[PDB]
Structures are given as structure tokens and as C-alpha cells.
Amino acid sequence: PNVLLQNLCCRILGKGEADVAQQFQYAVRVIGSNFAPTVERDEFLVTEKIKKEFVRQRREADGALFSELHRKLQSQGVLKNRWSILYLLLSLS
Amino acid sequence: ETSLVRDLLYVFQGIDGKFVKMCNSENCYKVDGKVAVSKSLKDITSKLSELGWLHNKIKKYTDQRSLDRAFGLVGQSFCAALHQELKEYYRLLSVLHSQLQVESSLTLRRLLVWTFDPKIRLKTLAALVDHCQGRKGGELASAVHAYTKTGDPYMRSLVQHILGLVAYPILNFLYRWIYDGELEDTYHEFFVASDPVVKTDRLWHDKYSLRKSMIPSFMTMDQSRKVLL
Amino acid sequence: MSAVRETMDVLLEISRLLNTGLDMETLSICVRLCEQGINPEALSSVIKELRR
Amino acid sequence: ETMDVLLEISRLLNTGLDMETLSICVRLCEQGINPEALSSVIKELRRASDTLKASE
Amino acid sequence: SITKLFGDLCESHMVSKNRTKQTLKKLAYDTLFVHLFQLPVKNKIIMLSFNLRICGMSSEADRLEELVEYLEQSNGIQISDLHAVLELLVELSGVQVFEADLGTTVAYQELEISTTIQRTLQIM
Amino acid sequence: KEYMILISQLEHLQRQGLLSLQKLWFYIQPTLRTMEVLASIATSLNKGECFGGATLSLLHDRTFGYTGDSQAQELCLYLTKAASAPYFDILERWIYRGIINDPYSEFMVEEHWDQRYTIVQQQIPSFLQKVADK
Amino acid sequence: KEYMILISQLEHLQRQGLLSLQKLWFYIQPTLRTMEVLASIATSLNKGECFGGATLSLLHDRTFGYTGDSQAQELCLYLTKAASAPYFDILERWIYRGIINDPYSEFMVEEHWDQRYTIVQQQIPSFLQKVADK
Amino acid sequence: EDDIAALVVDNGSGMCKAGFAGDDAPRAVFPSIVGRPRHQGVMVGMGQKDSYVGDEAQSKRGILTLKYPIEHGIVTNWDDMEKIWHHTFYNELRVAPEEHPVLLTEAPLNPKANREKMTQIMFETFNTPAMYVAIQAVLSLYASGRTTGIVMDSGDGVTHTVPIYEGYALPHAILRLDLAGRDLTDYLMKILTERGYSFTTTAEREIVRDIKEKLCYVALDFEQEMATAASSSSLEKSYELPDGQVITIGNERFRCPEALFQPSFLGMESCGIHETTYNSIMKCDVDIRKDLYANTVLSGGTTMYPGIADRMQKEITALAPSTMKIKIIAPPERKYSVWIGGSILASLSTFQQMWISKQEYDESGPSIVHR
């Protein structure tokens, strides 16, 4: 938990292990107050949102492909909290 | 058997039980109503009466306890610590009773040694309320202090507890009145009788006088005139 | 392990398509957290502040 | 001030140390005595006191 | 005066006499040297305050961070390796709102009663 | 709210029942202490009919009186503090600009040229009339 | 206390029957060896009506003569240390500070250059006279 | 056992400090002397005896001639060196070392031909079952609860500056500096002579070595301390020795600790204490230098002053870089810091297979010290 959270600050900022302290406290607080998901778990809602977004930009070809790739992510059977990851990518577009 | 275990329990928990106890010193311990019964009932029925008397002494002081706070700030502080050590006696009453229902077997002789450990506690609080009936301070503080002047290093912790809680309004009058000179006494329960006298601007006329007979014994005389000064 | 590689590949490709600004190492870290049941909302919020 | 602040932190982190032990520990830290070595020494002393106290 | 302090330390945790003190001194030294032979404190503190947050000790987390911040912003006045004092403390670490506190304390009072009853049965 | 929710916590111990009249008396020894103090404050306000500054000095008198009984102090203290933060807020709005407003006539300072006010002495703050003259 | 919980221990066995007079007497032989020395302690305190160092003197010579049974030596050793850690604490603050509290004439050296301090021999010590002089 | 029955003999550089383990000060310390009669006759003073040694040679020092078996820290003669070991075990302790292991000390710069020599003496002559030869540098570090650092041994011997990294010393950083405390006490007599008070009795000169630690004090910045003397400060104390001779301090108070940094008052071109500190660390490996700045330890009988701890601290930064944390660990006792480390070692758990016995001595002879 802690180590991963720290490594993230370290990596994106491109600064070393004890140089991330101030951000490290901000993330721990933001994470600490809203640690767990507050919204229902439902993969389907996110896939539809990601597909409306492509529709919205008329990048429909990238949308069609995105469905193939999402199906591929599911079929491999490796992840379990697929929704969260996809929601995190979508939020970051 | 088990009925005589319930019968002393109600007498500890309060008064009466399966026959009438109501008597305090009209007391033949408890009425049987019969005597065809064992003669070992006369010596278990004397052990039944002797915890309940010392529970009721602390209780009648707690009955006279409740006031807005009138005649003495110290008085209900002492009765507050007798309510706190009253509270400890009931937990020792609930662990007896827990034997009765299923969780087992009872015997009066084992719950006797579980009441023989409250008995050095609640007996000396029954002597401690006997020193002072009074509510006025600087003598309740002299009462709890005369008991650490007595021996027995296992009731010396139990009165020293009461001594720390009795002292807690007295010394809260003192250090604030050293720094500001604020006051609240209207019984003169502090060990300095704080201005009773008619108000005239000072010329060396006595307005503050200690009025020796409100001095704790957890302070001494040369320290009472130092803090008065 | 094989499966895991292929899975990271899909994830990297999805990332590229959605033009998010995540690379492989940051994304692996993001995935490990999410899988521990982390609130993605809160997490996105941290990540945007970290990119600023 | 400073000794009181450090006594609250001791309680929040559940380390159970009062002002006496804290003052002894502070003068050890100041003499350049390693924290990690000391946290071990302390774990052993608690364990040992409590053992001696239980046979009593 | 490393030598007094360590003697003081052996006596403090115990709040006959010479025999015990020498034993404790030996324990203490043996452990100390063995350990010696064999990150900055702030990131460790942060990890702990993070633990406090997930466990929902937020108020204590807020206070803890604030106090550490206060010591950092202070110049030391009687401590010369303030960082080490913090690290040692650190290395020694370890509605339905109102019914939770009441439920824990009531469960504890019942428990205390059970352990005292188990003790009373046990002596027999 | 904390009084009525504890009775439900011991009613979870009533589905596994083994509570006694004597075991329950132990939980009831804290909440008779809290409630008897709550009753003796409640009786005095009826007898007075006090409101506004007449409540404020009455609850300020219980902060003195219940010194030396520490946990009885905590509710009588809490009650004056929660009665003072409304009161002294109507005071502070008069310090930042100049608003005297009396909807119910909670504040003592009545509003009338000559700059008359007159306080009243019926109702007064937690402290004495010297704080009134200021 | 420590007599009467060992009593109840043996009555726990009596909740099943089995017990005869020589089944119980493996308890009576350790208790009998304690009491029989505790009763020969107890006569000299009472009819002596001793107090102070004089009390320590009777318990010290009883501790010397009962070296024959280790169980007998150990009780009067507990008796002479539970009677001396009070009396050691009064002399300890006397030789450390030089001020004493005796509200019951608790020490052999009573108060009241030429302010004479009189040491009595009715609290005649277990320790020698030469170390009592110092 | 050996937990309290291991003997700690710290053969220092002028005083032998013997005692039993699990104490914080030595039982009996006294300066090591022997005395040899020239012509034997009728004696005077203490009773018939073949040699007055030690504390029966310090009681009479004008009927005998004094000879230290330990001179400049190192054993010069080995015959008389056994005679002071004989004195420490049987008079100033009393136990036979044959049932009780012995922990004996060494210099950080004695030759190995000398080191096989002290092993040959304890095994054969005193017939010890086991013993261990231990450095004085590592013991004083051990009383200060560290395992690494440099100790500033300034004793009644050769100044040592020994950086030890994890119980292993750097064999290219142990400087032998010829300042001794006995050099300062001797310097102090000859500037007392500029005040007009001259010695002529050996007994008055013994109290010079006491006064050096006793009356004499150290303030920060000597240079302004003589400047504050020119405006007539209070610092001048006059000890009275019953007789007409006076030992005063006041204009020689600050020159005598100033001679630590400046050997020019002694008339030489040698290194000072801070200087010989700085030269020793400046030839140490660059990766473990940091650990030596933060674990500076004062030790010995020369740096016995109330205020020399902070003088060395304000003074050492002005040499070494300031991107080094230098912290002066100054114990108030430090003469006995070698001994407290030697007793604590007897009570070390990891020492019960580092003992050098007679059986391992029987298989490889006196090169078992190579260890």
C-alpha cells in the first residue's frame, strides 16, 4: 500500500525517494479520506462511457478497436478490478 | 442452599431478600421462621447481614448528597469519591451473580472470599464517613489525612485516593488565587476566610484573616501563613 | 507471467488510444493499487496534481 | 513545550513511554546512539521487566 | 555520560536490587552491540499517519502531522539530534458512530467480567 | 441521542439474554449521574422562567458549583459553552460593524440622537455588569 | 486471605464426595506448620504489648530459632519484613532528611546544639546499639 | 561463572586499574611503580620485603628510586612488568588467576614481537586458563556505546587517534604523537618559575599533576580569556599548600590547555591535538569518513576538564569541512572509560568463544595471538 503509493509520487515527479515528501502527505490524506470506492462496481458503465467519448470526438474507428482490446483484457482472466483501471485511464484522457 | 445465596445478595445489593431484614439494630440477623433447619444457618445468616450494613452507610450519605452545591464545595466532592468506590463494589456484586445462571455450581464459601476482598475496602470507607458528618472543608481534608497517619499499607492507598480527590477543589482555589486573586468561596471552605469584613480601602486593617480552624493537615502552619501573605 | 505481459500490453495500448500521458512504469503502479481495491476517483485526483 | 509535544506524539504512536523514560531516551539519542539498536534494547527491557514482575 | 543513562534506563522500565540491575545492564549492552555489528524519519511518520487514516483515526492523524510539523518548524532548544528522537519513537510504534464506542466499551466490560470469573474459577 | 442508543446496545445483549436487574444497574450508574444533573439543571430553569442573559448567568453559576466533581463538570461546562456561542455571537456582530438586533430579545441591549441604549440589568452576560459597561 | 482461598480449594474437591479426614490432612500439615509458629509469634505481641523496634526484636529472635523447618523460617521472614519496611522507612527519612513524623511515637528517637533528642529503650532495636547511636 | 568472575586488568600507561567485572569503576587504581633497593641492610618504614612495589613504593619515595615498568605506554623491561602484575593480582585484588579468566589491554601501536611477549607471560607465569588481548581504543569506544568512530586517547602515554570501523581499525591512520599528560605537568612547573615559586621536593610536584585536573578549568576561546585577564576578570585561584611555597593559577591557567593545540610552548614543531585529529582522518577512505566525524570520543586523563567538551566542538569545525556533522562525545569520566569498556566486555555474550586459552596456546605456541 504505502510503498506503492510512495513509488507513484516518485515516478511521475521523476524525483527520488525522500524528495516526494510534501506530495506524499497530500496523497496519503486525499487517499485516507476516500480510500475505498463510493460508487457501485459495474464494468459495463465505464465501457459505455469510454465508447460515448470516442463517439463524441468522432474517433469511431479508435472506439471499435477499443472494444476489441477491452474484450481481450477480460478474456485473459488476470485482473479482477478491471473497472477501476479503465475508469482511471478514462479520467486521465 | 441457593436460596440463601440469593437471600444475602439482595441484602448486599440493597436491603431485604426472601424475608424481612428491615431492621438495622433490632436485628436478629434475619428471621428464618423455622428452626428444624440446620444450625449452620445461624452463622451464614450473620455473614449475610454484615456486608449490607456497610453498603447502606455509604448509601445514606449518597441520599443526603444531592444539592445545588449549598453549604460547602468540599462536601460533595468527598461524597463523589464515595460514589466512585461505591461503583467499584457493584462490579464485585455482579461477578457473584454470574455464577448462578449458566455460562455453574455455587457455594457460599467461595463467594465469601470474593466479598472478603471488598471488605477491607468498604469497611474503611465506613470509618472514613464516620470522622466527619460535616460538609464544611479544611476538616474533611484533615480527616483523610489522619488515615494516612494510621498504619496498614493497604488501606493507605485507599484513603490516599480519597485524599487526592478531596484536595482537588482546595488546591484549585489556591494556585489561581496566587496568580490573580480570584475567589468564589461563600461558605469560607478555603483555608483562608476570604474577605467577610466590611469593605474599606486598606490602611493595615485586617480584612484577610485565616481564622484557624479550617486548616488541612496536608498543609502545615508556616506554609499557611506563606500563601496568605 | 506470460498472461501478465500480454495484459500489460493491452493496458499500454488502451492508454495510448485514450492519450492519457501514462507510460509503462506509472501504469504498472496504478494497476497494482487498483487491484488492492483503491478508489479510482481519488487516485485520478492525486495523479493530475502529480502531473502538474 | 518541546518535552510535552514529544510526550503527545509518544501516546499517538502507542509507544506507552512517559516523561521519565522519554527524558532518558532523549539524552541517549543526543549522544549519537542509534535509534534502531535502542528500539531493540528497549523491546528486550520491557519483556524482561514484565517477566520479573510476573514472578513477583 | 552513556554509562549513567543506561543504568537509569534499566531501572526505569521497572517502575535483589544490584543482582537484577547488573543482569539488565548486561541484556541491554549485549543487544545494543549485536544490533550495531549487524529513509528520513518524516516518510516513516507519513506511512504511520496513512495507517491511522485507513483505520479512520483521522483526528489523531491531523494532530500527529501538525505536531511533527511544529517540531520541524522549531529550532531545537534542548535536543541536538531531533531526527533520531523522532525515529526512535517511530521504531517503537505498534448514527452508527455513537453505538460503535458504546459497543466496544460494553463488550470490554463483559470481557473483564469474564476474565475475572475465569480467574476465580481457576484458583479453585 | 447517546442516551437512547446505548439502551439499544444492551438490547443486542438481550437477544443472548443474561442481563440481571443488578448487571443493568451498573450501566445505569453513569447515566443516573448524567441525567440527575440534567434534571437538577432542568428544575431551576422552570422555576426561573429564564431565557436570554438570565439563562446565561444561571448556567455560568453551575460551572463554579460543580468544580471538584470532574465528570459532572463536563456536561455543565458543555451546556454553558453551547449557550455562550450563540450569545457572544450577537455580541461580536455588534463589534464588527454595529448590529444590535433583538428578535426574541436574547441580548440585553435594547435600542432607542443621544445614543441611549440603557442595557438592562434584568439580563446580563456570563460575567457581571462591568462587562456590560464596556 | 491466603488461608481461606486454600480452604475453598479443597472444598472444590468436596463438591464431589470422596473426602475423608486423612484425605484433607495433606492440606492440614502445611497449614498446621504455618499456624503453630504464627500462634507462638502471636502471644508475645499481645501480652508484651510491644511497639516500635521492640517488636522487631521479638520477630528477629524467632526468626533465628526457627531454622529447623524452611517453611517455618519463611513465614517469620515475611513477618519481619512486612513489619520493618514501615519502620525502615521512618528512620530512612530521618537519616536522609533529618525531619520525622511520629504521631504515634513511631520511632525510638523522639524529638523533644542543646535541643536534646531522647532515644527510648521501650522501642529497643533488633539492630545493635552502636549503629543506633549513629 | 565469568560473568562477575572475570578479572579486568587495564594496564594503562602509567596506572594499572584492576578490578572484578560488573562494576562501573575499577576497584584499585594507583600509579605503577617498582623500587629496587641498592644495598640491603636494616629496613625502615614498612616491614621486611624483597621489593617495595606499587602503593608501598608510593608511600616511601625518598628511601627508594622510582622506575615505571610501563614507560611511554609501552613495556621497556619485562622482568619488572611481571612484578606489577604480581602486585595487581595478589595484593590489590586477591584471587589467583587460574580459575578466573583475565582481560588484559594493549597499545594500538605496540609491535607484534611485544605482543607475543605479553602472551608468553600470562600463560606460563600466572598460568591463566584463558585470557584475551584487547585494544584500549576499542574499549573506550565500547563505554560510549558505539562500535565505530575515532577515540581521542590522550592519556599518560602517547596520544592515539584511532578510527575504528566496525571493530577493525585502519592500519594507515594510527598516528603516534609525542604529547603526553606527563609532558604538561612538567611544562607547568617551569612556567611557575616565571611567577617565582620553584620546586625542589618531589612531593610538591605530585600535586602539580593533581592541580592540572582539579583547580585548572577550560573556558571557550582562550585568546579572549587572556584578553579578559587584561581587563582583570575573576579566574585566579591560589591553592595553599601548608609551607611557604604556593601553587597559584591565573596567568598559567589558560596556557596549559592551549599547549594542546600549540606544542610551541613545549618547544617543538610537532602536530597539535586537533591537528593530529585532522591528519588521521584525512588519509582515511572517503566512504567511511562521515561515520568518524559523528562518533568523536574523548578518552584519557589529559582531557580531564570541565569545559573541554565544547572547546573541541567549536574548534574542530574550523578545520574539517562544514558539510560534515561533527559531534564531540565527551563523558565526564574518561580515565576509567577504557576500564568500563573492559568490564563490559567480560559481560559480552559474543566473547565466550573469542577467549585465547592454554589449549589453543598448546597447538600453535605464542602466535595464537594472531587469532
Coordinates of C-alpha atoms in Angstrom, one line a residue, chain F:
Chain F
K1 CA -29.1 10.7 21.2
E2 CA -26.2 8.9 23.1
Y3 CA -28.6 8.1 25.9
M4 CA -31.1 6.2 23.7
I5 CA -28.6 4.4 21.6
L6 CA -26.8 2.7 24.5
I7 CA -30.1 1.1 25.6
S8 CA -30.3 -0.5 22.1
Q9 CA -26.6 -1.7 22.6
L10 CA -27.6 -3.6 25.6
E11 CA -30.7 -4.8 23.8
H12 CA -28.2 -6.7 21.4
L13 CA -27.2 -8.4 24.7
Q14 CA -30.9 -9.1 25.3
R15 CA -31.2 -11.5 22.3
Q16 CA -28.4 -13.5 24.0
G17 CA -30.0 -12.5 27.3
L18 CA -28.3 -12.8 30.6
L19 CA -28.7 -9.4 32.0
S20 CA -29.9 -9.1 35.5
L21 CA -31.5 -6.2 37.5
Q22 CA -28.1 -5.9 39.1
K23 CA -25.9 -6.1 36.0
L24 CA -28.0 -3.5 34.3
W25 CA -27.7 -1.2 37.5
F26 CA -24.0 -1.0 36.7
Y27 CA -24.6 0.7 33.2
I28 CA -27.2 2.8 34.8
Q29 CA -24.8 4.3 37.4
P30 CA -23.2 6.6 34.8
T31 CA -26.4 7.6 33.2
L32 CA -28.1 8.4 36.5
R33 CA -25.1 10.7 37.2
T34 CA -25.6 12.4 33.8
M35 CA -29.4 12.5 34.0
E36 CA -29.7 13.7 37.7
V37 CA -27.5 16.7 36.8
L38 CA -29.6 17.1 33.7
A39 CA -32.8 17.0 35.9
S40 CA -31.4 19.5 38.5
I41 CA -30.5 22.0 35.8
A42 CA -34.0 21.4 34.3
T43 CA -35.9 22.2 37.5
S44 CA -34.1 25.5 38.0
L45 CA -35.0 26.9 34.6
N46 CA -38.7 26.2 35.2
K47 CA -38.7 27.9 38.4
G48 CA -37.0 31.0 37.0
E49 CA -38.6 31.2 33.6
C50 CA -35.3 32.5 32.5
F51 CA -34.2 33.0 28.9
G52 CA -31.7 35.2 27.2
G53 CA -29.0 36.6 29.7
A54 CA -30.9 35.1 32.7
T55 CA -30.1 31.6 31.4
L56 CA -26.5 32.5 30.7
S57 CA -25.7 33.5 34.3
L58 CA -27.7 30.5 35.6
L59 CA -25.6 28.0 33.6
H60 CA -22.5 30.1 34.4
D61 CA -23.3 29.5 38.1
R62 CA -23.2 25.6 37.7
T63 CA -19.6 25.8 36.3
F64 CA -18.4 27.1 39.7
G65 CA -20.6 24.8 41.8
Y66 CA -19.7 21.6 40.1
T67 CA -15.9 22.0 40.5
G68 CA -14.4 19.1 42.2
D69 CA -16.7 16.7 40.6
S70 CA -14.8 16.3 37.4
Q71 CA -17.2 14.4 35.1
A72 CA -20.3 16.3 36.3
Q73 CA -18.3 19.3 35.3
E74 CA -18.1 18.2 31.7
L75 CA -21.8 18.4 31.0
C76 CA -22.4 21.6 32.9
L77 CA -19.4 23.2 31.3
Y78 CA -20.6 21.9 27.8
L79 CA -24.1 23.3 28.3
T80 CA -22.8 26.9 29.2
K81 CA -20.4 26.8 26.3
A82 CA -23.1 25.8 23.9
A83 CA -25.3 28.6 25.4
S84 CA -22.5 31.2 25.1
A85 CA -21.5 30.8 21.4
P86 CA -25.0 32.0 20.2
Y87 CA -24.9 34.7 22.9
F88 CA -21.4 36.1 22.3
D89 CA -22.0 35.8 18.5
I90 CA -24.8 38.5 18.8
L91 CA -22.1 40.4 20.8
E92 CA -19.4 40.1 18.0
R93 CA -21.8 41.3 15.3
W94 CA -22.1 44.4 17.2
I95 CA -18.2 44.7 17.5
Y96 CA -17.6 44.2 13.7
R97 CA -20.0 46.8 12.5
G98 CA -22.7 48.0 14.8
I99 CA -25.7 45.5 14.5
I100 CA -28.0 45.4 17.6
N101 CA -30.8 43.1 16.8
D102 CA -33.1 41.6 19.3
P103 CA -35.6 39.1 17.6
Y104 CA -36.6 37.4 20.8
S105 CA -34.7 39.9 23.0
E106 CA -32.0 37.4 23.7
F107 CA -29.3 40.1 24.0
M108 CA -29.9 42.7 26.9
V109 CA -29.1 45.8 24.9
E110 CA -32.2 47.5 23.9
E111 CA -32.3 50.0 21.0
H112 CA -33.8 53.5 21.4
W113 CA -29.7 61.3 18.9
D114 CA -28.2 61.0 22.4
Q115 CA -27.1 57.4 21.9
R116 CA -29.3 55.8 24.5
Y117 CA -29.4 52.1 24.9
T118 CA -29.7 51.7 28.7
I119 CA -28.6 48.0 28.7
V120 CA -30.9 46.2 31.0
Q121 CA -29.7 44.7 34.3
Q122 CA -32.5 42.0 34.1
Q123 CA -30.4 40.1 31.6
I124 CA -26.7 40.3 31.8
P125 CA -23.7 38.3 30.3
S126 CA -21.9 35.4 31.9
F127 CA -19.8 38.0 33.8
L128 CA -21.0 41.0 35.8
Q129 CA -22.1 44.4 34.8
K130 CA -18.6 45.8 34.4
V131 CA -18.5 43.7 31.1
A132 CA -21.8 45.5 30.4
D133 CA -20.4 49.0 30.8
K134 CA -17.7 48.2 28.3

